[PDB]
Symmetry: D5
């Protein structure tokens, strides 16, 4: 199993046609430099878990934008299908109007670069990538088809990475804003471990 | 990496510390149960003990849903045991009920695609493996940020639910939430009701 | 530039999920043995020329069925997209109910086997294949994207191939049922050439 | 199966000896730049369907020339055979005098570049190619041996490609001059679809 | 430069369609076992030297058949062309009725096996082969395009090979029936050399 | 089976030690530019047919020199053997004095370049080559071991190639000086074919 | 990945993180140029023979430093483990404070370069290397796991190499300071051999 | 740099001619099964350090034999040289009285198998191997040319391996008979570390 | 430089046509089993040193036959040349009276197998091989072209090999029948060395 | 079986340590430029035929030096062994003082370059090489182990090669100074052959 997506390395470059505010526009990974990016793939337009994930992120977009973070979704469907899906009512399993870009990957090049393409199925699994403001890949979350991801966990992870970027302390298991962190040194670590126990 | 979602999780075997003793442990020992199998970078470091303890102190939440937990690093079994015998207040683990698997040769780490060639240890990679030995979920964190027991629980529960019912789990699903019939007509029960 | 589609050789085997009467069904090339098959690819669901070709064949399907000929359409879109497109009114560029199976080629395997896949675009061009009842490929028609195919011409070709299969004769340029044909030998041919000259 | 002939790419260059106005002349693909070109192969001089196709295009040549289009025929026969066939009466299965060039491909190089050469037979199948004024290949039509092509369909295609070149609307299935066309975008397309339905 | 034609070895096998007494028939090299065969290639039907060679052998065929020798001619032209050429009057550069089979080699496989195919021209040079009753190649005569072969020389050679096949002795330069031969032995050869000197 | 001797291409270059008027001299193919060259191989000094061929050419040398043509013979024997053979009386199967250079090819390099070397025997067959004044190979005549070549035919051929070189008409089967030739043109050729028939 | 450690060649370069007086420091082989270096690997922190070796050298360090020799130990454990082991009481199988750098080789690159890595075990055997002030490898001692090395023998060897470096006389079996040495010359050697015997 | 000698694996098989009690005898590694073997190479007969090593081990052979251990020495010299050297008095740099076999390795096969051959010099460095009674290699000691090995250290090592083989406790740095050993268990080890500290 | 002739191995097999008692016969290396064979190549019939060598060995053949040894000579010349050279008087540089076989190696296979072929010259150097009664090659003597070999040295060598075959003592430099020989053992050799000194 | 030693080509370069006048010196083939060199290998110091060969040349050395010819001997033994052997009395099979350099070839490189190395034995056979003053190899003499070479024959060959270098003449079988020689040309040779016969 291959992939160019490697944590602590620059996220693999991508560019393509996206639907943005109902129109076709060219979108590039580099458009997002200077901001964190939640870049996630979903299997297929007009299916089941997928709309719920796209809608979940879209409807909570301000929780990301308020922390200098953007969100882009991608699938192997065409831009025409993305737009048709946006124009399908939510009650019919459509997206309705959406504020996050829907990127099209008809050739599968982007999916393969990110290691999320399913050769037997001709679409991706549920792969989500957290990329920092410097374009470095920090986190990879891959789900099998029948189980959707979590916006809340994605937010926690974004906050965690921004926190450690800024402060140089590290984040324990389950860390959320306000939680105790650790000075990553054999002596400094004791402040955390003695206070906790 | 041999770790591919929807395929058999790559076989592994090695020496682990279990109840303070050295024991040979094999992936196939867990068939019939879900397994949360996770790597952590290094004994005697910082985020790592918090992760092992977080899972360890909540182990019964897993065992009660037919799920086991195993942790692995490139450290030796002697180091694992010394770390267990180090007080939590000193950044140690204290007694622990989760097996600590040793991967000195790096073979297991490489098979799971979590080995860092530049560093000589793993990143924070967690794998959810079902009772049939099929890999269902991969979570990989860069070094500075720990994983989440809450999210791991949610995922195991979701996969067990979808295994049983064949309905699929929306974004953010937790026990008691609405699920979807994966059928062009059936799905409307979910989409219509929600909206 | 490669392909497995060779005229006078067995048409490359295919199988996949198709929409048939609003339901997802597995469909195989071999299901059509015993009958002529018009098997055509079109670029993309929810686009422009494509629906007009599918509707043109669909609305004239009995002209094919009455001559022991079936019609199957294929694209790189998913079965869910095919069904959503069927459920889109014709006035909005949808298909409406359709009696031609719509085959899904998400992996691009079928398209590549037939040599109609566009690597730069992630979809096929307008490729149509006429396959006889023995499974042998008899005719290949490839159009660039902007120009739709012709049901009249396709029908004429099916009739011609069926006619030459049955009789010891070959069909001159522009032949339609009822037109003069030629006996393919140095002496027999003169009955044709003397007649019309 | 291999070939250099790819739709939307430059038609493979060719050059050779042709019979033109009863004389041997060198002829090149690039001689037709600035005009559309119907370039077609036929199996064999002194056979059956072939003369009918050559005669059909030749006798209707003005229908092509009046729309800035030329026609060239090609086979694996020699220029001496082409000329002897021209000097054979139509009632004997000859061509009689002819106004389209008859290109010779004795080495099979041109046939192979166009993917129409039959290795087991030592001649071509019925392959026809429509090449635009910029030298780009737009259309490929390949028939098995028993069935002749259609001058009328060939004209329809040339007209359609010239129309879409000029207007940037696209041509529905069965389009002929005077027919409705489609604006190729998600909103503009509704002019066509709402009107027709 | 490659070839399978090797003197003193079995002549390379061939089989194909020939025109024989106005009909198309399958012909094989092995059809001629038990007789000497003069098997010759000529460049092109409807050309200049070629018919003179075919006619020269043809009109003297009984001089070959009276010494148990058959003659076969072959070119890269089709059987249809061979027949049309036969049906062309000699005064127009045709063959008229011919008793020598005309083999067709459209694929060029026979020509290439015999090493006489011109890659730059798409036809053969003037290559003649003398094959004995055991199928062993005994003589190869290859002429550039402008110069015809000789029936007299070909007859001399066939007679010489038959003579040496039958008797112990070998044939000096210029040998014709009735000429002195040589005993191929350091002592025996002296009968010849002493006599002539 | 390979070779560098290709008709209508430059004869393969050779150089070596020859016996010329009883002396050892270095000789080169290029020494013969500006003249036709009959270059011939023979199997073995002190054998049977070989001396008859060398003598047949040598004794009629002036018939070649009067038409600007030279003759060179070659074998795999040494120059020392050539000279000893020259010094052997004709009545003993020797050559006697001779004005044709005898070229030595001990390494077999020249023989292999001309495709006349017999791997099983360690000497050449009877291969004769006609090379024109421009160094282009025009004719190849290869005989099996038991049958000698013809000086008359070789002369006829040289005369023919020289004629066609000069006049650009072509020589029919059996042409000799004074015979009718053909203008190589579909119209021009009728002067010959009408006259003859 | 072959061993690069060759006696009489430059010791393979290494660099890494070491614990030195309780702190993490980058350490390089080249930091030791100008002095002899005893560079030794041990299997595993927190085991059995290993601490006894580190302590044996550690406690006798001045015996090395007084002969201008440094000592460095290395294993496949991390710097964090080295530090934790140093902070473990000797009574519990720990090191206590230590004046020898503990080098970490987590990636195994160094161990493999020195040929001491055990592929089946994931750690080194007991390999000790003596490297001179010019960086040349002079001595290799490899022990299987259950048997510890000797500080006495190590000292003896360092002294012998320094003696022979200085004087160019060579050191007999069992040499210690004050022992007889040999002039490496066929005549000079007799001073040793005669005195001894 | 390669070798077949690997600690904890079977020592590479060897066999060859040795001088034993003044006579040439074939000797095999397998002759020593059931006993420990100190197998050592030395550079060259008639040199300097080498005789002192052979003499040192030989003169102390009973200290090995009384612990079920044999000693064999090997160099790239011939058996004839070994014997002449034995017949040379010690005062002349010869071996004089001797009881250990001197194995000859003229082809360098054995030296290369053991990884002690010096390609630049044509002889071996000072490599010593300790092989157990099961034929497993336990210890490797390699010295550069100017410095001899130690009989006392070799004895210490043989005794240590025999002790660990027997008792399953392990030997600390500098162990000698009578010294403290360690139980290789995280609990059992404490008996040693608490006692010593 | 390559060859199959290796001292102490079976001499490479050969077979071919030889001149024996003025007749052509097939001859094989194995015809000589049970006898020693002096097998030698010479460059070229009708040259200079070569006849003196053939004559020298031949005229003294009884000195070989009376010690169970035969002699065979070989060159790259033909059997016809060998015979012609035999029939040439010695006073003219011929062989005249002869009793040793002259082997022919036209293909150079035998010469190449024995490593005596000169690729630049097309003949052998002066190579002589002494092969024993068991067919094992014992001695190789290779001379550059200008210098002849010695019958007396060859006899000395044949006698030496037979003596050592029979007695198992070895022959000192310059040994001839009746000379002292050596017992090849460190003690036995002293009989020779003490006596002679 | 390969080698770099080719007659008529530059002798393969060598350099190494030799014993000269009882001392070790580096010696190079190029050191002998301007003089003939007899360069010979012998199997083993302290053996049987070998000393007799070294002594036989050594005791007649002035017969070589007086004709500008040097002698060098070489074996796979060390320089230390050579010197020890020199210091062994002749009556004990030693060399005693010697004026011929004894070259050491411990690595076997020189022996392999000259094709005299025995892979199965780890030493050379008895190979002798005569190298002229320009460094060209002129003669190779290879003996199996049990039979020594000849100083008489070696001197004869050196004399002959020197003679043929100086004069335009070649040396018959068995030539010694004062013997008749041949002028190597077809006419001049007769002066030798007529006189002898």
């Amino acid at each position: 199993h291959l992939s160019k997506a490697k944590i602590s390395k620059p996220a693999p470059y991508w560019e393509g046609t996206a639907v943005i505010d109902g129109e076709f526009k060219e979108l590039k990974l580099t458009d997002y430099r200077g901001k964190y990016l939640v870049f996630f793939f979903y299997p297929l337009d007009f299916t089941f878990v997928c709309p719920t994930e796209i809608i979940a992120f879209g409807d909570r977009l301000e929780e990301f934008r308020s922390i200098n973070t953007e969100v882009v979704a991608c699938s192997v469907d065409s831009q025409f299908e993305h737009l048709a899906w946006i124009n399908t009512p939510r009650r019919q399993g459509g997206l309705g109007p959406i504020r996050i870009p829907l990127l099209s990957d008809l050739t599968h090049q982007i999916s393969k670069d990110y290691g999320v393409y399913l050769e037997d199925s001709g679409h991706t699994l549920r792969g989500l990538f957290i990329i920092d403001d410097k374009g470095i890949l920090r986190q990879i979350t891959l789900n099998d088809l029948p189980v959707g991801r979590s916006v809340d966990e994605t937010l926690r992870l974004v906050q965690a990475f921004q926190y450690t970027d800024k402060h140089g302390e590290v984040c324990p298991a389950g860390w959320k804003p306000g939680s105790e962190t650790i000075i990553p040194d054999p002596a400094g670590k004791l402040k955390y471990f003695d206070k906790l126990n």
